[PDB]
Amino acid sequence: ASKRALVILAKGAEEMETVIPVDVMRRAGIKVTVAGLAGKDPVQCSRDVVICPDASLEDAKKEGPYDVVVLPGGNLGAQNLSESAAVKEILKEQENRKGLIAAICAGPTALLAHEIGFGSKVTTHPLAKDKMMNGGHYTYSENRVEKDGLILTSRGPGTSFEFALAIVEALNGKEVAAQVKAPLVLK
Amino acid sequence: ASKRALVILAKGAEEMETVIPVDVMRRAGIKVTVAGLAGKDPVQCSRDVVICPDASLEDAKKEGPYDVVVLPGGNLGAQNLSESAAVKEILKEQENRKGLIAAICAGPTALLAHEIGFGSKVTTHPLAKDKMMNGGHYTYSENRVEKDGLILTSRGPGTSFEFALAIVEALNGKEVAAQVKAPLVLK
């Protein structure tokens, strides 16, 4: 069967950090569901790009567990994710079932807000470090992509490809990741 | 005043090649208009990401000339751009007025279809080279970003950031490009 990914899209989400992983994972044969936090309506991203989610988080949630739950960054988007009880439940369940959780940029602060994976080595956008480290519940890393067990984090728009490919490797293996990477014309 | 950019969005367009330049240019203070080729309705991109254009190409066109006309890639999207008479007129006018034209991935083949900038040194996605070189109307380059005068081209999803930053430098200068680049956490 094909692995499945849940991407939670909220207003203020960084559109590059949303689209790059969605696109790359789909190139990997992963069944991706772009779930709107607020509902089924179009989401206005941080730089005003408007994306239409495949479904509402409420409905997507009802579609069994996913092999990975992806949290895009963007300050306002991360704040929305952090204040959502629905998101809290989803991450709690994913962590409990030992499923992968991937967050990029300011996205990881949602993990702190919902007390997810405390003790994990994580990274975030440089400007989100202080917020993420409030209380010292995680150990900080400057690696472009950081994967501590089932907690995978990344730094920003510029690390989106590395972040996406790391998720692909975790779900479908190194061979698939390399196959998907070549046509992208990356480094 | 602020520079203005026209991004032409067609069905099948590569969403990463569309969103990255739009986002980066907006970070640069450039007024960007995402114009839908088919109309004002949402556009289904190559990897099914659905983007809502700011306006129709027909209406965007009526909004005077732009400092840059951007053509995203994606095979099906490039084909749509190449078959559009509206696009032909827009590029002809931009070239005539000596305005910048930027195309990435398969996007440059739209230039060939509309006989734009013949004789220019250009690059495209590796798989689009043969189509672009039919007739030998351009000279090929393997540079990740190629800028020959007012014709700026790039190779693929993985060169999108370099492509966008090149456009920013061309419109607003090196200082602004560097300022916009730092927060992205690129190479």
Side-chain angles (χ1 to χ4, degrees), chain A residues 14-15 23 26-27 47 50-52 125 144 157-158 161 183-186, chain B residues 14-15 23 26-27 47 50-52 125 144 157-158 161 183-186:
Chain A
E14 223 297 328
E15 45 272 76
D23 190 316
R26 281 180 173 157
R27 282 167 178 261
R47 272 65 190 178
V50 177
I51 301 178
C52 294
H125 180 92
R144 297 175 62 71
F161 282 101
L184 302 179
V185 196
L186 286 164
Chain B
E14 223 297 328
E15 45 272 76
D23 190 316
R26 281 180 173 157
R27 282 167 178 261
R47 272 65 190 178
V50 177
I51 301 178
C52 294
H125 180 92
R144 297 175 62 71
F161 282 101
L184 302 179
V185 196
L186 286 164

PDB file of all heavy atoms in Angstrom, chain A residues 14-15 23 26-27 47 50-52 125 144 157-158 161 183-186, chain B residues 14-15 23 26-27 47 50-52 125 144 157-158 161 183-186:
ATOM      1  N   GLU A  14       3.382  29.388   5.893  1.00  0.00           N
ATOM      2  CA  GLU A  14       4.333  29.792   4.865  1.00  0.00           C
ATOM      3  C   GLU A  14       4.021  28.903   3.657  1.00  0.00           C
ATOM      4  O   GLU A  14       4.189  27.684   3.720  1.00  0.00           O
ATOM      5  CB  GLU A  14       5.775  29.580   5.354  1.00  0.00           C
ATOM      6  CG  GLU A  14       6.696  30.745   5.009  1.00  0.00           C
ATOM      7  CD  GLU A  14       6.852  30.933   3.510  1.00  0.00           C
ATOM      8  OE1 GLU A  14       6.807  29.921   2.782  1.00  0.00           O
ATOM      9  OE2 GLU A  14       7.029  32.087   3.063  1.00  0.00           O
ATOM     10  N   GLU A  15       3.555  29.512   2.565  1.00  0.00           N
ATOM     11  CA  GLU A  15       3.177  28.747   1.376  1.00  0.00           C
ATOM     12  C   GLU A  15       4.273  27.898   0.738  1.00  0.00           C
ATOM     13  O   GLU A  15       3.983  26.849   0.173  1.00  0.00           O
ATOM     14  CB  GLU A  15       2.555  29.664   0.311  1.00  0.00           C
ATOM     15  CG  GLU A  15       3.294  30.964   0.062  1.00  0.00           C
ATOM     16  CD  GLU A  15       2.835  32.070   0.985  1.00  0.00           C
ATOM     17  OE1 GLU A  15       3.218  32.066   2.174  1.00  0.00           O
ATOM     18  OE2 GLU A  15       2.076  32.946   0.520  1.00  0.00           O
ATOM     19  N   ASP A  23       4.166  18.746  -2.786  1.00  0.00           N
ATOM     20  CA  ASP A  23       4.596  18.397  -4.135  1.00  0.00           C
ATOM     21  C   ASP A  23       5.612  17.248  -4.125  1.00  0.00           C
ATOM     22  O   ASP A  23       5.435  16.234  -4.809  1.00  0.00           O
ATOM     23  CB  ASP A  23       5.199  19.648  -4.781  1.00  0.00           C
ATOM     24  CG  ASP A  23       5.455  19.490  -6.266  1.00  0.00           C
ATOM     25  OD1 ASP A  23       5.981  18.443  -6.688  1.00  0.00           O
ATOM     26  OD2 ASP A  23       5.146  20.444  -7.010  1.00  0.00           O
ATOM     27  N   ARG A  26       4.151  13.896  -3.090  1.00  0.00           N
ATOM     28  CA  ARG A  26       3.302  13.329  -4.135  1.00  0.00           C
ATOM     29  C   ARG A  26       4.163  12.740  -5.246  1.00  0.00           C
ATOM     30  O   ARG A  26       3.795  11.738  -5.863  1.00  0.00           O
ATOM     31  CB  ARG A  26       2.333  14.386  -4.670  1.00  0.00           C
ATOM     32  CG  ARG A  26       1.158  14.587  -3.729  1.00  0.00           C
ATOM     33  CD  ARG A  26       0.157  15.626  -4.192  1.00  0.00           C
ATOM     34  NE  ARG A  26      -1.002  15.620  -3.295  1.00  0.00           N
ATOM     35  CZ  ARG A  26      -1.845  16.634  -3.127  1.00  0.00           C
ATOM     36  NH1 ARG A  26      -1.678  17.766  -3.794  1.00  0.00           N
ATOM     37  NH2 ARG A  26      -2.856  16.516  -2.273  1.00  0.00           N
ATOM     38  N   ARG A  27       5.319  13.352  -5.494  1.00  0.00           N
ATOM     39  CA  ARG A  27       6.234  12.830  -6.502  1.00  0.00           C
ATOM     40  C   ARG A  27       6.754  11.487  -6.001  1.00  0.00           C
ATOM     41  O   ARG A  27       7.149  10.628  -6.786  1.00  0.00           O
ATOM     42  CB  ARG A  27       7.416  13.787  -6.711  1.00  0.00           C
ATOM     43  CG  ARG A  27       7.091  14.999  -7.572  1.00  0.00           C
ATOM     44  CD  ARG A  27       8.187  16.047  -7.488  1.00  0.00           C
ATOM     45  NE  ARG A  27       7.898  17.187  -8.352  1.00  0.00           N
ATOM     46  CZ  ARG A  27       8.423  17.375  -9.561  1.00  0.00           C
ATOM     47  NH1 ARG A  27       9.284  16.503 -10.066  1.00  0.00           N
ATOM     48  NH2 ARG A  27       8.069  18.436 -10.274  1.00  0.00           N
ATOM     49  N   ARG A  47       2.308  34.979   2.547  1.00  0.00           N
ATOM     50  CA  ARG A  47       2.612  35.935   1.491  1.00  0.00           C
ATOM     51  C   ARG A  47       1.457  36.048   0.493  1.00  0.00           C
ATOM     52  O   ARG A  47       1.657  36.237  -0.708  1.00  0.00           O
ATOM     53  CB  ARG A  47       3.924  35.563   0.783  1.00  0.00           C
ATOM     54  CG  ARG A  47       5.170  36.151   1.449  1.00  0.00           C
ATOM     55  CD  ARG A  47       5.393  35.590   2.856  1.00  0.00           C
ATOM     56  NE  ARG A  47       6.443  36.305   3.579  1.00  0.00           N
ATOM     57  CZ  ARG A  47       6.805  36.044   4.834  1.00  0.00           C
ATOM     58  NH1 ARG A  47       6.210  35.077   5.517  1.00  0.00           N
ATOM     59  NH2 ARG A  47       7.751  36.771   5.421  1.00  0.00           N
ATOM     60  N   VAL A  50      -3.069  31.989  -2.154  1.00  0.00           N
ATOM     61  CA  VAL A  50      -4.266  31.319  -1.660  1.00  0.00           C
ATOM     62  C   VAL A  50      -4.323  29.868  -2.117  1.00  0.00           C
ATOM     63  O   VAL A  50      -4.370  29.582  -3.312  1.00  0.00           O
ATOM     64  CB  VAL A  50      -5.546  32.064  -2.121  1.00  0.00           C
ATOM     65  CG1 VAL A  50      -6.791  31.318  -1.649  1.00  0.00           C
ATOM     66  CG2 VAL A  50      -5.536  33.484  -1.574  1.00  0.00           C
ATOM     67  N   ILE A  51      -4.316  28.952  -1.153  1.00  0.00           N
ATOM     68  CA  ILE A  51      -4.358  27.528  -1.453  1.00  0.00           C
ATOM     69  C   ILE A  51      -5.694  26.912  -1.040  1.00  0.00           C
ATOM     70  O   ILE A  51      -6.245  27.247   0.012  1.00  0.00           O
ATOM     71  CB  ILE A  51      -3.218  26.782  -0.717  1.00  0.00           C
ATOM     72  CG1 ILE A  51      -1.865  27.358  -1.149  1.00  0.00           C
ATOM     73  CG2 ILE A  51      -3.301  25.288  -0.987  1.00  0.00           C
ATOM     74  CD1 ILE A  51      -0.671  26.732  -0.444  1.00  0.00           C
ATOM     75  N   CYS A  52      -6.212  26.017  -1.878  1.00  0.00           N
ATOM     76  CA  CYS A  52      -7.474  25.333  -1.602  1.00  0.00           C
ATOM     77  C   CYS A  52      -7.188  23.941  -1.045  1.00  0.00           C
ATOM     78  O   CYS A  52      -6.726  23.055  -1.764  1.00  0.00           O
ATOM     79  CB  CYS A  52      -8.309  25.206  -2.880  1.00  0.00           C
ATOM     80  SG  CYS A  52      -8.891  26.771  -3.550  1.00  0.00           S
ATOM     81  N   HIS A 125      13.383  27.768  12.802  1.00  0.00           N
ATOM     82  CA  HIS A 125      13.946  28.919  12.123  1.00  0.00           C
ATOM     83  C   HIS A 125      14.720  29.642  13.225  1.00  0.00           C
ATOM     84  O   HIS A 125      14.306  29.625  14.387  1.00  0.00           O
ATOM     85  CB  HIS A 125      12.849  29.848  11.611  1.00  0.00           C
ATOM     86  CG  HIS A 125      13.380  31.048  10.894  1.00  0.00           C
ATOM     87  ND1 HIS A 125      13.582  31.072   9.532  1.00  0.00           N
ATOM     88  CD2 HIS A 125      13.829  32.236  11.363  1.00  0.00           C
ATOM     89  CE1 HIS A 125      14.134  32.224   9.192  1.00  0.00           C
ATOM     90  NE2 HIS A 125      14.295  32.947  10.284  1.00  0.00           N
ATOM     91  N   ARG A 144      20.293  21.751   9.363  1.00  0.00           N
ATOM     92  CA  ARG A 144      19.239  22.187   8.452  1.00  0.00           C
ATOM     93  C   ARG A 144      18.008  21.300   8.581  1.00  0.00           C
ATOM     94  O   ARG A 144      16.874  21.762   8.426  1.00  0.00           O
ATOM     95  CB  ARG A 144      19.784  22.211   7.025  1.00  0.00           C
ATOM     96  CG  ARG A 144      20.915  23.232   6.870  1.00  0.00           C
ATOM     97  CD  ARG A 144      21.550  23.198   5.495  1.00  0.00           C
ATOM     98  NE  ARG A 144      20.606  23.530   4.432  1.00  0.00           N
ATOM     99  CZ  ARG A 144      20.108  24.745   4.211  1.00  0.00           C
ATOM    100  NH1 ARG A 144      20.458  25.764   4.980  1.00  0.00           N
ATOM    101  NH2 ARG A 144      19.254  24.938   3.213  1.00  0.00           N
ATOM    102  N   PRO A 157      12.129  28.187   4.730  1.00  0.00           N
ATOM    103  CA  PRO A 157      11.806  28.022   3.310  1.00  0.00           C
ATOM    104  C   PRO A 157      12.939  27.356   2.542  1.00  0.00           C
ATOM    105  O   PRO A 157      12.711  26.457   1.728  1.00  0.00           O
ATOM    106  CB  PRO A 157      11.564  29.455   2.845  1.00  0.00           C
ATOM    107  CG  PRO A 157      11.016  30.123   4.079  1.00  0.00           C
ATOM    108  CD  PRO A 157      11.939  29.587   5.153  1.00  0.00           C
ATOM    109  N   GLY A 158      14.159  27.809   2.821  1.00  0.00           N
ATOM    110  CA  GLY A 158      15.342  27.289   2.155  1.00  0.00           C
ATOM    111  C   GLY A 158      15.744  25.868   2.505  1.00  0.00           C
ATOM    112  O   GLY A 158      16.635  25.309   1.864  1.00  0.00           O
ATOM    113  N   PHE A 161      13.134  21.650   0.792  1.00  0.00           N
ATOM    114  CA  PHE A 161      13.399  20.480  -0.042  1.00  0.00           C
ATOM    115  C   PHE A 161      14.058  19.373   0.773  1.00  0.00           C
ATOM    116  O   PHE A 161      13.680  18.205   0.669  1.00  0.00           O
ATOM    117  CB  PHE A 161      14.300  20.845  -1.225  1.00  0.00           C
ATOM    118  CG  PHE A 161      13.577  21.535  -2.343  1.00  0.00           C
ATOM    119  CD1 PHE A 161      13.653  22.915  -2.497  1.00  0.00           C
ATOM    120  CD2 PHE A 161      12.816  20.799  -3.247  1.00  0.00           C
ATOM    121  CE1 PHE A 161      12.978  23.557  -3.540  1.00  0.00           C
ATOM    122  CE2 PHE A 161      12.139  21.429  -4.289  1.00  0.00           C
ATOM    123  CZ  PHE A 161      12.221  22.810  -4.436  1.00  0.00           C
ATOM    124  N   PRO A 183      15.153  14.525 -10.656  1.00  0.00           N
ATOM    125  CA  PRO A 183      14.446  15.435 -11.566  1.00  0.00           C
ATOM    126  C   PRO A 183      14.217  16.857 -11.036  1.00  0.00           C
ATOM    127  O   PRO A 183      13.798  17.734 -11.783  1.00  0.00           O
ATOM    128  CB  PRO A 183      13.113  14.719 -11.819  1.00  0.00           C
ATOM    129  CG  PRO A 183      13.426  13.269 -11.547  1.00  0.00           C
ATOM    130  CD  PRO A 183      14.312  13.360 -10.331  1.00  0.00           C
ATOM    131  N   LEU A 184      14.476  17.085  -9.754  1.00  0.00           N
ATOM    132  CA  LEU A 184      14.245  18.406  -9.172  1.00  0.00           C
ATOM    133  C   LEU A 184      15.311  19.436  -9.505  1.00  0.00           C
ATOM    134  O   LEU A 184      15.074  20.642  -9.392  1.00  0.00           O
ATOM    135  CB  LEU A 184      14.119  18.294  -7.652  1.00  0.00           C
ATOM    136  CG  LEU A 184      13.017  17.364  -7.145  1.00  0.00           C
ATOM    137  CD1 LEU A 184      13.044  17.340  -5.624  1.00  0.00           C
ATOM    138  CD2 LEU A 184      11.657  17.842  -7.650  1.00  0.00           C
ATOM    139  N   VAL A 185      16.478  18.958  -9.924  1.00  0.00           N
ATOM    140  CA  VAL A 185      17.607  19.818 -10.254  1.00  0.00           C
ATOM    141  C   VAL A 185      18.062  20.623  -9.034  1.00  0.00           C
ATOM    142  O   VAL A 185      18.259  21.838  -9.108  1.00  0.00           O
ATOM    143  CB  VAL A 185      17.285  20.796 -11.413  1.00  0.00           C
ATOM    144  CG1 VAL A 185      18.586  21.377 -11.968  1.00  0.00           C
ATOM    145  CG2 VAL A 185      16.522  20.080 -12.518  1.00  0.00           C
ATOM    146  N   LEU A 186      18.210  19.933  -7.906  1.00  0.00           N
ATOM    147  CA  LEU A 186      18.686  20.554  -6.674  1.00  0.00           C
ATOM    148  C   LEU A 186      20.214  20.553  -6.720  1.00  0.00           C
ATOM    149  O   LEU A 186      20.802  20.262  -7.760  1.00  0.00           O
ATOM    150  CB  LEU A 186      18.212  19.758  -5.455  1.00  0.00           C
ATOM    151  CG  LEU A 186      16.735  19.886  -5.074  1.00  0.00           C
ATOM    152  CD1 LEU A 186      16.344  18.767  -4.116  1.00  0.00           C
ATOM    153  CD2 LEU A 186      16.492  21.253  -4.443  1.00  0.00           C
TER     154      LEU A 186
ATOM    155  N   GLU B  14       3.841  23.994 -12.525  1.00  0.00           N
ATOM    156  CA  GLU B  14       4.522  23.376 -11.394  1.00  0.00           C
ATOM    157  C   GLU B  14       4.301  24.335 -10.219  1.00  0.00           C
ATOM    158  O   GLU B  14       4.783  25.469 -10.242  1.00  0.00           O
ATOM    159  CB  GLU B  14       6.018  23.203 -11.696  1.00  0.00           C
ATOM    160  CG  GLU B  14       6.559  21.846 -11.259  1.00  0.00           C
ATOM    161  CD  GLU B  14       6.475  21.648  -9.755  1.00  0.00           C
ATOM    162  OE1 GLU B  14       6.600  22.649  -9.022  1.00  0.00           O
ATOM    163  OE2 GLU B  14       6.292  20.495  -9.309  1.00  0.00           O
ATOM    164  N   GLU B  15       3.563  23.884  -9.204  1.00  0.00           N
ATOM    165  CA  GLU B  15       3.249  24.740  -8.059  1.00  0.00           C
ATOM    166  C   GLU B  15       4.438  25.289  -7.276  1.00  0.00           C
ATOM    167  O   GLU B  15       4.359  26.387  -6.734  1.00  0.00           O
ATOM    168  CB  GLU B  15       2.285  24.031  -7.094  1.00  0.00           C
ATOM    169  CG  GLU B  15       2.628  22.589  -6.777  1.00  0.00           C
ATOM    170  CD  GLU B  15       2.018  21.623  -7.768  1.00  0.00           C
ATOM    171  OE1 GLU B  15       2.534  21.510  -8.899  1.00  0.00           O
ATOM    172  OE2 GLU B  15       1.008  20.979  -7.415  1.00  0.00           O
ATOM    173  N   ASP B  23       6.250  34.217  -3.644  1.00  0.00           N
ATOM    174  CA  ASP B  23       6.584  34.466  -2.246  1.00  0.00           C
ATOM    175  C   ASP B  23       7.855  35.315  -2.112  1.00  0.00           C
ATOM    176  O   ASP B  23       7.861  36.352  -1.439  1.00  0.00           O
ATOM    177  CB  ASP B  23       6.760  33.113  -1.551  1.00  0.00           C
ATOM    178  CG  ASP B  23       6.862  33.224  -0.043  1.00  0.00           C
ATOM    179  OD1 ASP B  23       7.582  34.107   0.458  1.00  0.00           O
ATOM    180  OD2 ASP B  23       6.228  32.393   0.640  1.00  0.00           O
ATOM    181  N   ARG B  26       7.444  38.913  -3.265  1.00  0.00           N
ATOM    182  CA  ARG B  26       6.647  39.696  -2.325  1.00  0.00           C
ATOM    183  C   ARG B  26       7.485  40.061  -1.106  1.00  0.00           C
ATOM    184  O   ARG B  26       7.313  41.134  -0.523  1.00  0.00           O
ATOM    185  CB  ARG B  26       5.380  38.932  -1.931  1.00  0.00           C
ATOM    186  CG  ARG B  26       4.319  39.024  -3.014  1.00  0.00           C
ATOM    187  CD  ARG B  26       3.035  38.285  -2.696  1.00  0.00           C
ATOM    188  NE  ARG B  26       2.037  38.574  -3.730  1.00  0.00           N
ATOM    189  CZ  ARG B  26       0.989  37.809  -4.017  1.00  0.00           C
ATOM    190  NH1 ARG B  26       0.776  36.682  -3.354  1.00  0.00           N
ATOM    191  NH2 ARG B  26       0.157  38.168  -4.988  1.00  0.00           N
ATOM    192  N   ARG B  27       8.405  39.177  -0.726  1.00  0.00           N
ATOM    193  CA  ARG B  27       9.291  39.462   0.396  1.00  0.00           C
ATOM    194  C   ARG B  27      10.197  40.618  -0.015  1.00  0.00           C
ATOM    195  O   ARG B  27      10.698  41.360   0.827  1.00  0.00           O
ATOM    196  CB  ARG B  27      10.151  38.238   0.735  1.00  0.00           C
ATOM    197  CG  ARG B  27       9.422  37.164   1.529  1.00  0.00           C
ATOM    198  CD  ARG B  27      10.214  35.868   1.565  1.00  0.00           C
ATOM    199  NE  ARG B  27       9.536  34.855   2.367  1.00  0.00           N
ATOM    200  CZ  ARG B  27       9.840  34.558   3.629  1.00  0.00           C
ATOM    201  NH1 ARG B  27      10.827  35.188   4.251  1.00  0.00           N
ATOM    202  NH2 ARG B  27       9.140  33.635   4.275  1.00  0.00           N
ATOM    203  N   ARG B  47       0.960  18.922  -9.430  1.00  0.00           N
ATOM    204  CA  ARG B  47       0.875  17.938  -8.361  1.00  0.00           C
ATOM    205  C   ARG B  47      -0.386  18.141  -7.515  1.00  0.00           C
ATOM    206  O   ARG B  47      -0.392  17.927  -6.302  1.00  0.00           O
ATOM    207  CB  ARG B  47       2.139  17.971  -7.489  1.00  0.00           C
ATOM    208  CG  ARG B  47       3.265  17.072  -8.005  1.00  0.00           C
ATOM    209  CD  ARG B  47       3.797  17.534  -9.364  1.00  0.00           C
ATOM    210  NE  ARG B  47       4.710  16.561  -9.962  1.00  0.00           N
ATOM    211  CZ  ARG B  47       5.279  16.700 -11.158  1.00  0.00           C
ATOM    212  NH1 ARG B  47       5.043  17.777 -11.894  1.00  0.00           N
ATOM    213  NH2 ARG B  47       6.072  15.745 -11.634  1.00  0.00           N
ATOM    214  N   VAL B  50      -4.009  23.270  -5.385  1.00  0.00           N
ATOM    215  CA  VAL B  50      -4.923  24.217  -6.014  1.00  0.00           C
ATOM    216  C   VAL B  50      -4.661  25.641  -5.544  1.00  0.00           C
ATOM    217  O   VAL B  50      -4.781  25.949  -4.359  1.00  0.00           O
ATOM    218  CB  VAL B  50      -6.398  23.834  -5.727  1.00  0.00           C
ATOM    219  CG1 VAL B  50      -7.341  24.867  -6.338  1.00  0.00           C
ATOM    220  CG2 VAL B  50      -6.686  22.450  -6.291  1.00  0.00           C
ATOM    221  N   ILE B  51      -4.299  26.508  -6.484  1.00  0.00           N
ATOM    222  CA  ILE B  51      -4.010  27.900  -6.169  1.00  0.00           C
ATOM    223  C   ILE B  51      -5.082  28.832  -6.734  1.00  0.00           C
ATOM    224  O   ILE B  51      -5.565  28.633  -7.851  1.00  0.00           O
ATOM    225  CB  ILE B  51      -2.635  28.316  -6.744  1.00  0.00           C
ATOM    226  CG1 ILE B  51      -1.540  27.419  -6.158  1.00  0.00           C
ATOM    227  CG2 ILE B  51      -2.365  29.786  -6.462  1.00  0.00           C
ATOM    228  CD1 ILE B  51      -0.147  27.706  -6.698  1.00  0.00           C
ATOM    229  N   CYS B  52      -5.451  29.844  -5.952  1.00  0.00           N
ATOM    230  CA  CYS B  52      -6.451  30.824  -6.372  1.00  0.00           C
ATOM    231  C   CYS B  52      -5.751  32.087  -6.866  1.00  0.00           C
ATOM    232  O   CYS B  52      -5.169  32.837  -6.080  1.00  0.00           O
ATOM    233  CB  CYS B  52      -7.378  31.183  -5.206  1.00  0.00           C
ATOM    234  SG  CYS B  52      -8.422  29.831  -4.638  1.00  0.00           S
ATOM    235  N   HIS B 125      14.700  22.876 -18.111  1.00  0.00           N
ATOM    236  CA  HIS B 125      14.860  21.630 -17.387  1.00  0.00           C
ATOM    237  C   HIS B 125      15.553  20.715 -18.395  1.00  0.00           C
ATOM    238  O   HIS B 125      15.305  20.819 -19.599  1.00  0.00           O
ATOM    239  CB  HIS B 125      13.507  21.024 -17.030  1.00  0.00           C
ATOM    240  CG  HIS B 125      13.618  19.739 -16.273  1.00  0.00           C
ATOM    241  ND1 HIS B 125      13.636  19.686 -14.896  1.00  0.00           N
ATOM    242  CD2 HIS B 125      13.801  18.468 -16.701  1.00  0.00           C
ATOM    243  CE1 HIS B 125      13.827  18.437 -14.509  1.00  0.00           C
ATOM    244  NE2 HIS B 125      13.931  17.678 -15.584  1.00  0.00           N
ATOM    245  N   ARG B 144      22.442  26.970 -13.743  1.00  0.00           N
ATOM    246  CA  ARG B 144      21.207  26.835 -12.977  1.00  0.00           C
ATOM    247  C   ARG B 144      20.271  28.006 -13.244  1.00  0.00           C
ATOM    248  O   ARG B 144      19.047  27.853 -13.238  1.00  0.00           O
ATOM    249  CB  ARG B 144      21.546  26.695 -11.494  1.00  0.00           C
ATOM    250  CG  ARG B 144      22.349  25.420 -11.217  1.00  0.00           C
ATOM    251  CD  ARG B 144      22.795  25.313  -9.772  1.00  0.00           C
ATOM    252  NE  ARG B 144      21.673  25.251  -8.841  1.00  0.00           N
ATOM    253  CZ  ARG B 144      20.856  24.209  -8.703  1.00  0.00           C
ATOM    254  NH1 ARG B 144      21.025  23.122  -9.440  1.00  0.00           N
ATOM    255  NH2 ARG B 144      19.864  24.258  -7.823  1.00  0.00           N
ATOM    256  N   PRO B 157      12.389  22.925 -10.265  1.00  0.00           N
ATOM    257  CA  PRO B 157      11.945  23.191  -8.894  1.00  0.00           C
ATOM    258  C   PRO B 157      13.106  23.556  -7.981  1.00  0.00           C
ATOM    259  O   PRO B 157      13.018  24.497  -7.186  1.00  0.00           O
ATOM    260  CB  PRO B 157      11.287  21.876  -8.486  1.00  0.00           C
ATOM    261  CG  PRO B 157      10.744  21.351  -9.790  1.00  0.00           C
ATOM    262  CD  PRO B 157      11.900  21.614 -10.732  1.00  0.00           C
ATOM    263  N   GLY B 158      14.195  22.800  -8.113  1.00  0.00           N
ATOM    264  CA  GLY B 158      15.379  23.009  -7.297  1.00  0.00           C
ATOM    265  C   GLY B 158      16.172  24.273  -7.571  1.00  0.00           C
ATOM    266  O   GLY B 158      17.091  24.595  -6.816  1.00  0.00           O
ATOM    267  N   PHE B 161      14.543  29.048  -6.127  1.00  0.00           N
ATOM    268  CA  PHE B 161      14.994  30.124  -5.248  1.00  0.00           C
ATOM    269  C   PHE B 161      16.011  31.011  -5.956  1.00  0.00           C
ATOM    270  O   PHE B 161      15.936  32.239  -5.882  1.00  0.00           O
ATOM    271  CB  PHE B 161      15.617  29.559  -3.968  1.00  0.00           C
ATOM    272  CG  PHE B 161      14.608  29.096  -2.959  1.00  0.00           C
ATOM    273  CD1 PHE B 161      14.306  27.746  -2.820  1.00  0.00           C
ATOM    274  CD2 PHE B 161      13.955  30.018  -2.146  1.00  0.00           C
ATOM    275  CE1 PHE B 161      13.365  27.316  -1.879  1.00  0.00           C
ATOM    276  CE2 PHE B 161      13.015  29.600  -1.206  1.00  0.00           C
ATOM    277  CZ  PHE B 161      12.721  28.247  -1.073  1.00  0.00           C
ATOM    278  N   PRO B 183      16.887  35.600   5.598  1.00  0.00           N
ATOM    279  CA  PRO B 183      15.862  34.917   6.398  1.00  0.00           C
ATOM    280  C   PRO B 183      15.343  33.594   5.820  1.00  0.00           C
ATOM    281  O   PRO B 183      14.624  32.866   6.495  1.00  0.00           O
ATOM    282  CB  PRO B 183      14.738  35.956   6.495  1.00  0.00           C
ATOM    283  CG  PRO B 183      15.444  37.272   6.287  1.00  0.00           C
ATOM    284  CD  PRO B 183      16.420  36.937   5.190  1.00  0.00           C
ATOM    285  N   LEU B 184      15.692  33.285   4.577  1.00  0.00           N
ATOM    286  CA  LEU B 184      15.204  32.059   3.949  1.00  0.00           C
ATOM    287  C   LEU B 184      15.919  30.795   4.395  1.00  0.00           C
ATOM    288  O   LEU B 184      15.397  29.689   4.235  1.00  0.00           O
ATOM    289  CB  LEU B 184      15.301  32.175   2.427  1.00  0.00           C
ATOM    290  CG  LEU B 184      14.547  33.349   1.802  1.00  0.00           C
ATOM    291  CD1 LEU B 184      14.767  33.340   0.298  1.00  0.00           C
ATOM    292  CD2 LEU B 184      13.057  33.245   2.127  1.00  0.00           C
ATOM    293  N   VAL B 185      17.108  30.964   4.963  1.00  0.00           N
ATOM    294  CA  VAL B 185      17.929  29.848   5.417  1.00  0.00           C
ATOM    295  C   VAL B 185      18.310  28.934   4.250  1.00  0.00           C
ATOM    296  O   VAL B 185      18.177  27.710   4.328  1.00  0.00           O
ATOM    297  CB  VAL B 185      17.225  29.005   6.512  1.00  0.00           C
ATOM    298  CG1 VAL B 185      18.254  28.118   7.214  1.00  0.00           C
ATOM    299  CG2 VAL B 185      16.540  29.911   7.525  1.00  0.00           C
ATOM    300  N   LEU B 186      18.769  29.544   3.161  1.00  0.00           N
ATOM    301  CA  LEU B 186      19.218  28.801   1.987  1.00  0.00           C
ATOM    302  C   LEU B 186      20.677  28.411   2.222  1.00  0.00           C
ATOM    303  O   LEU B 186      21.186  28.557   3.332  1.00  0.00           O
ATOM    304  CB  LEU B 186      19.120  29.672   0.733  1.00  0.00           C
ATOM    305  CG  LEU B 186      17.718  29.922   0.168  1.00  0.00           C
ATOM    306  CD1 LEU B 186      17.751  31.088  -0.812  1.00  0.00           C
ATOM    307  CD2 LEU B 186      17.212  28.653  -0.509  1.00  0.00           C
TER     308      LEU B 186
END
